[PDB]
Design a protein around this nucleic acid. Structure first.
Ligand SMILES: [Mn+2]
Ligand SMILES: [Mn+2]
Ligand code: NA
Ligand code: NA
Length: 327
DNA sequence: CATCTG
DNA sequence: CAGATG
């Protein structure tokens, strides 16, 4: 956690680099398990050889661990942090819509920068276009103080369209969190479930309302259950307009809301722990449901849930206010 | 995993 | 349809 800090970090830059710039999924993948095991490793790695001894640690990595330990640096890392082509790829990638792949295409055409991008708005696609337009806003975190206003808006319009909708804003926003990255809303309706063969209007209606009133500005992607958009809190009394924010809306069969809701509320760590305990208490948990564990090795059958309460109970545990769901 | 692009 | 992105 700090005993093998550099090592794990350098290794990460390496892995990261393989995948992003080059294509080296194997290699990239190699660096990964590698930092993971050393990450768990209980002592102070005093040398390459020492390391090698670990699984996932071959000669090539050991080689590296040496030079890094031998000198505060690594040539390879040094050579990579320089190289403009690498850098460009890490940058283009910041735009929502541009992945590695595309980063590579663009650079190999000379687009390496924002302007580059602007001058060639033709080559970019709609998502990427939005992305480029809101690059700035996009990186701006979302302060809880806005979160609450947003939340307030969304819940009110959903209510209006149908009293039966059930909306929930998950995310750390849900866990306390002073600011957040994007607005994550979980949605269901009674008339929508596991079996109940579809109902897309279910999602489409609300989507409309939000735009109706301008909360929603652009559509990144709009499927029948998931929607990736852009929204914005109305600018009050002109002098101060709000940054454009990322927002996601998702339909869920009522029969699996809370596991979902639980799940999205995180944190990853709280999930895991809960999940493990679930297992002890003879259970199974995932995104959508909780199941009774047979002894034959495994087994299923959807345990019925009516709240997040229902779940804990099942695994016979302490109801956790979302706040303390931290770890 | 759900959506898009081409 | 594969393949990319989130
Ligand atoms: Mn979030
Ligand atoms: Mn999001
Ligand atoms: Na080994
Ligand atoms: Na991106």
């Amino acid at each position: 956690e700090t005993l093998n800090g550099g090592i794990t970090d350098m290794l990460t830059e390496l892995a990261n680099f393989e995948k992003n710039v080059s294509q080296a999924i194997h290699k990239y993948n190699a660096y990964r398990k590698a930092a993971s095991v050393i990450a768990k490793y209980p002592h102070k790695i005093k040398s390459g050889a020492e390391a090698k001894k670990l699984p996932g640690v071959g000669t090539k990595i050991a080689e590296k661990i040496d030079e890094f330990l031998a000198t505060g640096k690594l040539r390879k890392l040094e050579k990579i942090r320089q190289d403009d082509t690498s850098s460009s790829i890490n940058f283009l990638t910041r735009v929502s819509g541009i992945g590695p792949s595309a980063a590579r295409k663009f650079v190999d055409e000379g687009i390496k920068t924002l302007e580059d991008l602007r001058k060639n708005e033709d080559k970019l696609n709609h998502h990427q276009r939005i992305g480029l337009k809101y690059f700035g806003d996009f990186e701006k975190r979302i302060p809880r103080e806005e979160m609450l206003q947003m939340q307030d808006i969304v819940l009110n319009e959903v209510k209006k369209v149908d009293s039966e909708y059930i909306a929930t804003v998950c995310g750390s926003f849900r866990r306390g969190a002073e600011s957040s990255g994007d607005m994550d809303v979980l949605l269901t309706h009674p008339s929508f479930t596991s079996e109940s063969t579809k109902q897309p209007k279910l999602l489409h209606q609300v989507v409309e309302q939000l735009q109706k009133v301008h909360f929603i500005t652009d559509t990144l992607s709009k499927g029948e259950t998931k929607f990736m958009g852009v929204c914005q809190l109305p600018s009050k009394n002109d002098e101060k307009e709000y940054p454009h924010r990322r927002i996601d809306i998702r339909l869920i069969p009522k029969d699996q809301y809370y596991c979902g809701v639980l799940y999205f509320t995180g944190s990853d760590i709280f999930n895991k722990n809960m999940r493990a305990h679930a297992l002890e208490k003879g259970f199974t948990i995932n995104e959508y449901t909780i199941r009774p564990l047979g002894v034959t090795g495994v087994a299923g059958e959807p345990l019925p849930v009516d709240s997040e309460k229902d779940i804990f109970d099942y695994i016979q545990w302490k109801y956790r206010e979302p706040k303390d769901r931290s770890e």
